[PDB]
UniProtKB/Swiss-Prot annotation, chain B:
Ubiquitously expressed. Residues 32-36 are annotated as: Interaction with APC. It is found in: Cytoplasm, Cytoskeleton; Cytoplasm, Cytoskeleton, Microtubule organizing center, Centrosome; Golgi apparatus; Cytoplasm, Cytoskeleton, Spindle. This is Microtubule-associated protein RP/EB family member 1. Belongs to the MAPRE family. Residues 45-67 are annotated as: APC-binding. The gene is MAPRE1. Signal peptide: none annotated.
């Protein structure tokens, strides 16, 4: 059991908790940035595949139409 | 100005700051989960597309080959189709 004034104990502990929370926020911010990069990466692939379907008359090609259906599905387009 | 002990003032203000930071951390956690769901949504579409390319393996379809090239690309950015 400490001999310190409890108010002094808590002022120190609360400042340590504030610092810890700020550090956790920085860590979660970097996770967000990583996830934005991965999300952008996969969306960029979908966009590039859409451009291929557009260049190659996807609406006149039955296999490409099924890929187009996935591109524009509001769910994952699973069949 | 108040007659409050400055230590009592800071004990209250520090706990208010802790509560605000915990709320910010919850919000960032929600953003992480939103981004994971969006990323998984797009990955699932790409996986479904790859299965259609797999189904057509043996046809030598050059448009499907260009799609597979995108699926397995390592670089970011737009690819202008030919
Ligand atoms: Mg052409």
């Amino acid at each position: 059991l400490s001999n310190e004034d409890p108010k002094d104990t808590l002022l120190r502990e609360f400042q340590e908790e504030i610092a810890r929370l700020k550090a956790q926020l920085e860590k979660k911010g970097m996770l967000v940035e990583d996830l934005e990069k991965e999300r952008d990466f996969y969306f960029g692939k979908l966009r590039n595949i859409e451009l291929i379907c557009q260049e190659n008359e996807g609406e006149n090609d039955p296999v490409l139409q099924r890929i187009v259906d996935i591109l524009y599905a509001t769910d994952e387009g699973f069949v």
